[PDB]
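Please complete every field before forwarding. Incomplete forms are returned to the sender.

SECTION A: IDENTIFIERS
Entry label: holo-492
Bound molecule: calcium ion
Molecule representation: SMILES string

SECTION B: INPUTS
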Amino acid sequence: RRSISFSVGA
Amino acid sequence: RRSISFSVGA
Amino acid sequence: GSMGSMERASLIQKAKLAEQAERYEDMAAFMKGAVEKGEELSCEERNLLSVAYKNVVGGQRAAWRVLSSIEQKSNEEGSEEKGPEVREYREKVETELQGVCDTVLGLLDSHLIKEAGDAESRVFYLKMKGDYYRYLAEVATGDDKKRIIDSARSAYQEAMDISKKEMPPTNPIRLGLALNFSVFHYEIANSPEEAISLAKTTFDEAMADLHTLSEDSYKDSTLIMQLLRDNLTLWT
Amino acid sequence: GSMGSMERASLIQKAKLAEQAERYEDMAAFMKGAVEKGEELSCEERNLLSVAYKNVVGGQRAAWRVLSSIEQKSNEEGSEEKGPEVREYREKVETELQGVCDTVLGLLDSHLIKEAGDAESRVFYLKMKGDYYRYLAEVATGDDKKRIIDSARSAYQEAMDISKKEMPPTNPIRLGLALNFSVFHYEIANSPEEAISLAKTTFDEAMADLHTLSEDSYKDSTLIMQLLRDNLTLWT
Ligand SMILES: [Ca+2]
Ligand SMILES: [Ca+2]
Ligand SMILES: [Ca+2]
Ligand SMILES: [Ca+2]
Ligand SMILES: [Cl-]
Ligand SMILES: [Cl-]
Ligand SMILES: [Mg+2]
Ligand SMILES: [Mg+2]
Ligand SMILES: [Mg+2]
Ligand SMILES: [Mg+2]
Ligand SMILES: [Mg+2]
Ligand SMILES: [Mg+2]
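SECTION C: PREDICTED COMPLEX
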């Protein structure tokens, strides 16, 4: 599975 | 709820 | 047009790739290009055309409904007595939706329907004509609305007449046509009793013909029958 | 450009409508128009810009990965020794993706970063610069690849240095930056140990500062901390 990134909100 | 329509496949 | 330099077979291949990639605007553009080669479409190719444009117009319809809802509240007794922006953006989305419908209807008229002689192809295209006039009717006001509704009705009716003469009651295209014409009656034509009657007759006539079918055909037909039942449950 | 005749406030309003309608390409176009008015963006407006382009580029990345996978199989030992179509369509999607990234990077360079003096705005924009160079790096070959990677690294590093000086360890922008820089290390820079180290230090330093926070701030910070933990679980 690819890694999880984040911007602003889910 | 709106009515369900159909084309080709789900 | 833009796809004029690409081989027909390549357009079809790329439409299938676009479907896999969930690139439905690309898919529709490839399929429009394929239609514009001038040759008839196979069963598989008709299905690709329908899937592409169903997904494009589906996103536009969903957006339009969101924006229309917001617009109705903003012109309720005492809501955001605000500016023109909601209406303007709803109108933008509406015009784009109408343009997609007009594109599909134009492909049907130039020249898919006129060259379609087998019942499967002709019913498929006439159903599609009814569907895209129905989508136009969902957003219509002004002087031609009644006329848009009658265009949808007329296309569905010609499809129905052919399907009843030429197809068994379990044929998936016949079933999907009847389903969508029943939705037209309920949601567009203010004819819920006609909708209910058509759904029930369609369901019952299909049930009586299931015994003739293979396991795979049975699965296909019963899936659409369940949609008829789902509407009947909503409507009754 | 195209949005030059629309009021700034109207562009912002329509961006919010587009978000509600899940019209992310429209949303991005409205927000580009707002940036091009030349004024700085508020916190809320920066968030709208990011949401719009994250969704646009996200669809393109997902499509690219599907098509790249199909392309790898077709050039495996003995698969579809077929035609140029898969490569051509992957290349089409790739070029569109690169164009979106270049657009975002262009907005950052003209002139969002240079006018951003507060830590919240400057870190936000530098993080975004790192992110969009990272998306370029995901698809890069050819002579400038190393250079794309170093551009991402440099932007993230400047953001990190500011965030550590100027923000508490629970600040959501600081946390999201550290999360994304750790993804860069793991997925782009072939540095899994650095990724793991950064995620763990970030998590632990945030945990030690939670006691300072309100209930709402606590919720915001812990949500992002859980993403760090989710990656650590995948990576270890
Ligand atoms: Ca014919
Ligand atoms: Ca027959
Ligand atoms: Ca400033
Ligand atoms: Ca500070
Ligand atoms: Cl507009
Ligand atoms: Cl292509
Ligand atoms: Mg064309
Ligand atoms: Mg040819
Ligand atoms: Mg209108
Ligand atoms: Mg512009
Ligand atoms: Mg002004
Ligand atoms: Mg390329």
